[PDB]
Amino acid sequence: MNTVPFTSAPIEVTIGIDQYSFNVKENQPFHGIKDIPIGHVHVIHFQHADNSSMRYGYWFDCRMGNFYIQYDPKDGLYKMMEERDGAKFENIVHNFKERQMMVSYPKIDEDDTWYNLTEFVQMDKIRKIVRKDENQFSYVDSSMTTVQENELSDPAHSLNYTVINFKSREAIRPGHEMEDFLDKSYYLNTVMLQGIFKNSSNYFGELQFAFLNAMFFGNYGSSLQWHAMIELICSSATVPKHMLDKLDEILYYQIKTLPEQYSDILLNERVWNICLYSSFQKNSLHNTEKIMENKYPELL
Amino acid sequence: GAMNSSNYAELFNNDIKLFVDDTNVYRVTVHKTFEGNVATKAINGCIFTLNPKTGHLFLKIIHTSVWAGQKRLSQLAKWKTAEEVSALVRSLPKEEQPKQIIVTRKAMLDPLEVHMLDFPNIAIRPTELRLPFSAAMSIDKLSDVVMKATEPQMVLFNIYDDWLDRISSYTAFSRLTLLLRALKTNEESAKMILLSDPTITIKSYHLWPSFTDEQWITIESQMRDLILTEYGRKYNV
Ligand SMILES: CSc1ncccc1C(=O)N1CCCC1
Ligand SMILES: CSc1ncccc1C(=O)N1CCCC1
């Protein structure tokens, strides 16, 4: 179990760690989060109390280094940093634990929620979507735009998700216009899976990362990517059986985790009704359709 | 974006554009089978592709053989229309290709956009106007060439005859839409009006009779009366 110590908490802030969150008061004796499960990526995220604008955060994997948080009073945010001095870090953490200055990652033993949300998400792929190669962790915030959003403005600060456009020469084979537009299997299986992602695990990893960014940061672009990747599968007549079964599980846990009161800002009526009720896969997502119909029947 | 009554005059500027109407591409008669079920029999159709500034009509005849063995024909018809319009654009020299294509029905937007991805600078636009182009098969010489076709065929017409020698393309389009609206609302009467005077003939190389300017005014008035007449008969006004 790993630890992300905090130097201090000088401004009042709501701190998220994965699907959990807690309030820290201004100058409260808070010095970080312990007992973080090894084996998964994690995200630690922030919303300042005095300006809920700019929610932001950091994706990280404690196996890749020793990371801590320190508030920067010039740039006005909590920054993730790497400590290269291993013995310094271990000594810092131990003192904070002995003084019980850390909150515990509050994982219930029955609970696989975080695994199920991050099953295919890897740090190496996060770092290709979010380009800042001098750090081992990745910053994301509410305002960052995707490459697709910018085609339609600072490129160093973009989310490099795979572009998905249904009316694009990449999506549509000359001479198969109607075929490829009404059945997107060529685009899914040949262009995207065989060609760009190489395998379904990488595709699901980007889908899951886009959902998590959309939900934790209120990032609109990430929400568009997430919906686009779902629709591309549901709008394909030929999808491997194992991919459909896994997609149903992925979406089930995403819908299960969504705040009930954000379903207006995180769910696209058109995509979901199309996917569950009109698409080729309308009958292949039993778990997702049941939780959607019982939790968000208004949207449908 | 969409073409409506506010931007109506853009049709007659010097940017090449085409209207595409697909309402006569897939045509059927519905009949009873020996077992008392219902079936359809397709008949030849046509794509109506019109330059409203010059009157040039590219009439692509859709022969019933293109439907053989195909499913979901009303949906296929929109994609076949888009395929043929794209093929027509590619056949034209660059300097004759349209800058805009206006579709009369919104269901043609995606099929035509997809077939025209190679032409990103050609705008595909809908219209809010209710244009009477469905009545093109009430023009006798157009209906004749469509029904006689034994194979796919493109036939070229000027739907304005020689009108542009004497009137502008705004006025010519207005005359055309009035004639088509009349033929659409009461074909028998409209044709009666157009041919009631045997001394006015249709030249072999024209679609409409050789009316003088003064006679067109009478004709146009008789057509408005017909449209108003039918409006009253329809609504009991
Ligand atoms: C997840 S999108 C989001 N979330 C939080 C705050 C604002 C937005 C946003 O830009 N939205 C645009 C359409 C739906 C909401
Ligand atoms: C990933 S979908 C996306 N992303 C960024 C900006 C716009 C869109 C979007 O909804 N689009 C609809 C048609 C093509 C673009």
Side-chain angles (χ1 to χ4, degrees), chain A residues 1-151 154-300, chain B:
Chain A
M1 312 302 273
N2 273 122
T3 303
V4 174
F6 275 51
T7 294
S8 65
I11 73 160
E12 199 155 291
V13 60
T14 302
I15 301 178
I17 176 73
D18 300 351
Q19 75 269 32
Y20 310 112
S21 69
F22 53 96
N23 303 304
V24 175
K25 297 294 171 301
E26 180 194 316
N27 289 320
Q28 179 182 322
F30 176 83
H31 293 282
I33 304 164
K34 61 184 201 162
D35 302 328
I36 304 168
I38 310 161
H40 315 290
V41 308
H42 297 278
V43 59
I44 185 169
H45 41 116
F46 301 91
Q47 197 156 29
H48 297 182
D50 73 343
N51 168 36
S52 49
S53 302
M54 182 182 44
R55 286 181 226 171
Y56 64 93
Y58 303 87
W59 290 93
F60 66 95
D61 182 331
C62 280
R63 291 173 292 190
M64 293 168 62
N66 295 322
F67 306 115
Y68 64 100
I69 300 286
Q70 178 169 111
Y71 181 75
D72 177 0
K74 173 160 160 99
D75 291 347
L77 76 181
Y78 286 98
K79 300 200 172 157
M80 183 159 278
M81 303 200 274
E82 180 170 359
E83 178 57 70
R84 65 159 303 117
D85 185 352
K88 182 173 187 186
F89 187 81
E90 295 173 9
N91 173 237
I92 279 306
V93 173
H94 177 259
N95 176 85
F96 285 157
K97 283 188 178 179
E98 280 293 281
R99 310 216 286 153
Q100 294 194 35
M101 299 270 83
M102 302 193 160
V103 296
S104 175
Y105 186 95
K107 195 191 160 300
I108 301 324
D109 314 282
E110 169 201 42
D111 176 46
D112 271 351
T113 292
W114 189 245
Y115 174 76
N116 289 335
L117 288 171
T118 62
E119 175 176 3
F120 304 98
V121 180
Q122 329 166 262
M123 259 325 298
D124 65 280
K125 298 305 199 312
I126 289 177
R127 295 183 68 234
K128 300 180 192 308
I129 297 169
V130 189
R131 305 195 163 290
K132 193 164 205 269
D133 285 336
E134 68 278 9
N135 298 327
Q136 294 287 297
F137 48 81
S138 299
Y139 172 93
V140 180
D141 69 29
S142 48
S143 74
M144 283 169 47
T145 51
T146 74
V147 164
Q148 191 153 351
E149 277 183 296
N150 298 328
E151 300 168 357
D154 180 359
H157 216 60
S158 291
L159 290 167
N160 299 280
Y161 292 115
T162 295
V163 178
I164 294 206
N165 181 3
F166 287 164
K167 301 196 282 193
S168 74
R169 175 52 67 220
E170 297 69 21
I172 300 289
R173 285 176 296 180
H176 307 249
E177 288 84 3
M178 183 189 195
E179 167 181 15
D180 284 352
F181 186 71
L182 294 178
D183 172 7
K184 320 216 173 262
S185 299
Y186 153 77
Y187 193 31
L188 168 68
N189 292 309
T190 298
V191 178
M192 285 285 165
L193 285 180
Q194 165 175 291
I196 298 190
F197 287 99
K198 306 309 177 189
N199 53 65
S200 54
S201 297
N202 289 337
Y203 185 100
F204 288 144
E206 186 166 328
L207 185 158
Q208 287 180 315
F209 184 58
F211 171 76
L212 292 166
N213 284 336
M215 168 164 69
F216 287 134
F217 302 117
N219 187 269
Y220 183 52
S222 304
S223 177
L224 300 187
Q225 181 67 16
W226 179 46
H227 274 92
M229 301 187 78
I230 295 169
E231 190 175 351
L232 175 52
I233 288 171
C234 295
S235 300
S236 293
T238 305
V239 185
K241 318 87 174 52
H242 73 276
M243 261 192 82
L244 295 170
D245 286 337
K246 184 63 68 164
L247 179 65
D248 192 28
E249 290 303 321
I250 285 166
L251 301 178
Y252 173 81
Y253 285 101
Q254 291 173 335
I255 300 301
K256 178 175 172 66
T257 304
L258 269 182
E260 301 66 34
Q261 304 287 307
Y262 288 25
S263 37
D264 66 295
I265 49 234
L266 274 157
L267 288 183
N268 185 277
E269 185 192 62
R270 179 191 73 81
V271 168
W272 282 100
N273 274 276
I274 273 54
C275 290
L276 296 176
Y277 299 125
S278 339
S279 79
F280 290 104
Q281 306 305 343
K282 60 190 177 307
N283 294 324
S284 306
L285 306 173
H286 308 110
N287 293 353
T288 289
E289 181 170 298
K290 189 168 296 310
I291 192 176
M292 283 288 293
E293 290 186 351
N294 278 281
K295 188 175 186 198
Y296 299 121
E298 323 85 29
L299 198 88
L300 322 166
Chain B
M3 205 274 290
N4 57 32
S5 287
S6 298
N7 57 20
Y8 181 71
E10 187 182 9
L11 294 175
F12 315 110
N13 74 17
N14 291 98
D15 281 1
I16 300 173
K17 41 183 66 69
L18 298 167
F19 277 114
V20 171
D21 184 89
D22 69 316
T23 67
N24 286 309
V25 168
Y26 174 47
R27 299 211 285 155
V28 305
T29 51
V30 177
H31 59 82
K32 278 285 191 59
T33 71
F34 177 88
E35 294 75 25
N37 303 128
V38 175
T40 60
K41 190 189 143 306
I43 61 173
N44 292 342
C46 59
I47 307 164
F48 181 96
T49 298
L50 171 64
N51 187 328
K53 177 91 166 163
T54 59
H56 287 198
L57 172 63
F58 301 85
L59 193 76
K60 174 67 190 225
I61 303 182
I62 304 298
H63 185 264
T64 58
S65 65
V66 307
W67 310 127
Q70 308 293 331
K71 276 88 180 85
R72 290 194 54 86
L73 295 182
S74 62
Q75 179 176 261
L76 178 63
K78 301 171 197 316
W79 291 86
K80 175 57 169 193
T81 298
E83 183 178 31
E84 292 289 352
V85 168
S86 164
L88 168 72
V89 172
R90 293 168 206 274
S91 78
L92 293 167
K94 196 191 188 207
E95 81 268 348
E96 304 180 28
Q97 290 175 335
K99 299 294 182 154
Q100 303 178 12
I101 300 173
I102 303 163
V103 298
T104 61
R105 306 201 291 178
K106 300 195 203 69
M108 282 301 305
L109 292 166
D110 279 351
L112 189 58
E113 165 163 13
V114 169
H115 271 281
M116 302 288 290
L117 293 171
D118 287 334
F119 290 100
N121 299 339
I122 303 188
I124 309 299
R125 301 178 57 204
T127 177
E128 298 299 343
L129 302 171
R130 52 277 187 172
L131 298 162
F133 292 149
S134 78
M137 290 291 101
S138 301
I139 300 173
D140 291 315
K141 287 188 187 190
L142 300 187
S143 176
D144 283 352
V145 67
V146 170
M147 291 313 290
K148 296 185 198 292
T150 57
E151 46 186 321
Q153 174 181 2
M154 161 85 99
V155 185
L156 310 178
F157 299 87
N158 190 318
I159 203 161
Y160 298 153
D161 294 343
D162 57 357
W163 302 345
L164 295 178
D165 299 343
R166 306 196 60 85
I167 63 181
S168 69
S169 70
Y170 180 109
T171 300
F173 192 81
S174 294
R175 183 185 286 164
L176 173 70
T177 61
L178 170 65
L179 292 173
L180 288 178
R181 186 55 75 196
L183 289 156
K184 185 165 179 178
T185 318
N186 194 319
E187 184 179 10
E188 182 216 328
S189 309
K191 293 184 169 191
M192 286 174 61
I193 290 170
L194 286 167
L195 323 169
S196 59
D197 184 334
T199 75
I200 322 171
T201 69
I202 301 172
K203 296 304 153 288
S204 63
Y205 51 86
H206 283 168
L207 296 176
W208 313 96
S210 298
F211 293 122
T212 56
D213 295 11
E214 297 313 303
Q215 291 176 332
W216 269 123
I217 302 288
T218 305
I219 293 300
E220 293 168 340
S221 173
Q222 289 171 351
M223 293 294 187
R224 286 191 296 270
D225 287 351
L226 174 169
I227 291 165
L228 186 61
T229 288
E230 284 309 322
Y231 179 96
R233 288 167 83 258
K234 195 215 233 202
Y235 293 104
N236 293 328
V237 165

